[model samples]
Target: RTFFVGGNWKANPKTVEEAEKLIEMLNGAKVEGNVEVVVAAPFVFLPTLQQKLRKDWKVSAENVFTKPNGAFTGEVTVPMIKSFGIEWTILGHSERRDILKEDDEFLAAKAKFALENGMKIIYCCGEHLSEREAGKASEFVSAQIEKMIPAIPAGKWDDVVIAYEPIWAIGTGKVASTQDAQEMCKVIRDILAAKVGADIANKVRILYGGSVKPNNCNELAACPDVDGFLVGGASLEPGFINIVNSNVHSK
Candidate 1:
């Protein structure tokens, strides 16, 4: 699989002009031939971003709820997202889990609904510092993976992308060692094997997110199981373009 990079502009760049500045830079900057880029903005900005993206780039929603549309005043649905030509959706982000009250089951349901509606998923999974300190990191992530597998069939997992984004490692200048990242990513692959079988499990793209910047990206991206990344703070500007090219340019 080619390297995939997603710029999650989560509530940053408060004005449209700032967003346009970022887009103009990317549109003009050179991207590695081997890298695939996707920029996810707030719902209000998705249409504009999608229209302005270069041919190789794509757009994703920062988040999506399980509901398909109804009395849920501020919610957006899979159909709505698909209608706008959105290709990817991020679910179960640590911030969403810790701050928005979405549980494992609910996140799974959202994934199912999104899959059924033909939208691709950027499925997020990770553990807190406490979970890692207790030595149950793999177990916790496995359970979360298992909860989501039943939604999309074994054969259709190709539409899903798994992101192993540790809550503690997101920002704060913290990073999971290469060994820790590859081990958990491979373990997540192993758990998927039971539900979807070995072929799809091994083929599925797994990304590492959380504090990914130019400095540490090359080493992390080089991990065999670490296919790509869901970048945070560093993904905001021209810095991200360098991070995107790091795998190809950094020595």
Candidate 2:
């Protein structure tokens, strides 16, 4: 499988001008090796990203409402985003789950609606510090995936990607060791194989999210089960090219 790198520019830059500047930097990046790159930005900025960013790379929505269209105030719906030709979204992100109080059922509904409406997704799952400290990371993560599994429509697994964001590592200046990333990715893959079948498991692309930077991306990319990254702060910086370039090192 070709490596995948997605830049989650979560509510960044504060202006369309800055976003375009970042896009300019990304457009200038000389990418090498086989890689699939997508950049997700705030709802308001997606149009600019789609129009200005390099065509080889795709633009994505940071999140979407569960319905295709509704009276839901301040919510962007699946059809609304799809109307702009933005095909991908990041769902179940740590920020949405922790800060916005999105529960498993809410996220599962979003996944089902997004897929049924012809949108692809990058689904986030992970354990917090407490769960990690208690050594229940796998159990915690598996439950999240289990909730998401039933939501996917038949033949839609191809449109789904899973990103394991270690909440314990996010914003603490800590990063999961390569071993930890590989282990969790393998665990997720095994879960898919057992529950969905080996065909889907083998084709699914699982990414490592949290504290990914140019300095550490190389080692993480080298991990056998680590397919790519769902980059955060680094995605807004020039070093994002290095993170994207790490795909070259993935074997």
Candidate 3:
């Protein structure tokens, strides 16, 4: 039941019509397993998508603000998303980190707000290619998780799902080797254990993203710490069905 997959359709689709068509594909197809399926769309599509999605599927927002309400004109707050019954949010995304310059404080604040308002978080952490080459992969991922450790309240830890997406692998044809992904994922679990406790850390669901596809999903899912995946480009394509079914035949 811990297995999960998410589609991060970041700023995609040329029109509302295209988006609706995509939803139809999801509704018409039969998924191969019991893993959780959550899809995030541009905020413009949530209201419509939520109405049509099956009860098992969840709609997630692209991002949210830490503050409940403020003069921050363009930002949506936790209460706002929660009000619409959105139970999940993606935090610490590459676009937010690289383009918006969202620092650790901002991301931690966002995670706190989401948790406080009944929203679970898909917390992503990874190092860029250069950082990995510099032998700072473990250090980098831990530093990111460190920010959220103090923010989430006690006993609410189960709601957070970690997504590990190496910067170099994302959107590039290059995927992380299974050994490499497993090693970093264990580092993530260890950090959680150090911050929280073994019980919670051991049970936490960690997902791998970045260049994930049908051909490689099984190998990635076989990794000890890889509970599932947060699919990006592959999820947008029709091949996502194959990717979802890969774990069905996994060893």
Candidate 4:
């Protein structure tokens, strides 16, 4: 797996004008190693990123409707996004799962639809705080991947990236340890090896999406199974550049 770093600007910046500044910030970063970077922003701001952001880096959608086109008011479709040359999307994010009430079934459909439509996806899966506390993190997370596995087309594994969210850490002022990031990602890789095959498992990228930042990024990136990051807070700041370059440690 090529080192992957995705900066997801989830419903942020407060304005399109602010979005441009963030894009400009990302465009100026001096990436230092072999890495594939994808920046995901709100749908309203994609046109600008697609047009203005660095061509070397790719732009992504925060979410997408499973349908190509329809009366699904307020929802964007893959074809519509593809029309703008946007080819990546994020699905099954924790906020969309818990806040928007998007369950596994809906996410699997979204994943299938996106992959079949010739789009790449970062499929999110993680255990909640309570689930972790119950010592069922592996079981819960593996179940999620199990659902997602069948949704992926045989030759399409290359287009799918599994992002493990340390859901327990979100907004809890609690940081997931580097060990936590490593262990969970290893578990995910193992699930893919067992359920699919070692070939697809080794080739697929697995990312850690909890509290990723410039300060701790290099440490997390050095993990054996941690292929990259789905950065948060620092993604909007200059620190994101360091996270992007941190792949040097992993290599």
**TM-scores of the models, in the given order?**
0.93, 0.97, 0.94, 0.98
Q: Give the C-alpha lDDT of model 4.
A: 0.93
Cα lDDT tens digits for candidate 3, 204-248: 888887678877888887777777888887767887777776666
C-alpha lDDT values of all predictions: 0.81, 0.93, 0.82, 0.93
Residue 196, model 2: Cα distance from true site in angstroms: 0.7
Deviation in Å, model 4, residue 152 alpha carbon: 0.6
Candidate 4 has which clashing residue pairs, if any?
Answer: none
Please, what are the lDDT tens digits per residue for candidate 1 over residues 102-159?
8999998999888888888888998888788798998899889989888885456778
**Model 4: CA > 4 A from native:** none
Which residue pairs in candidate 1 have backbone atoms (N, alpha carbon, C) closer than 3 angstroms, thus clashing? Answer: none
**Lowest lDDT block of 10, candidate 4:** 167-176
Please provide, for model 4 over 111-170, each residue's C-alpha lDDT reduced to its tens digit, 9 standing for 90 to 100.
Answer: 999999999999999998888889899999999999998889879999999899999888
Clashes of 4: 0
- All candidates in order of TM-score, best leading: 4, 2, 3, 1
Task: Put the candidates in lDDT order, highest first.
Answer: 4, 2, 3, 1
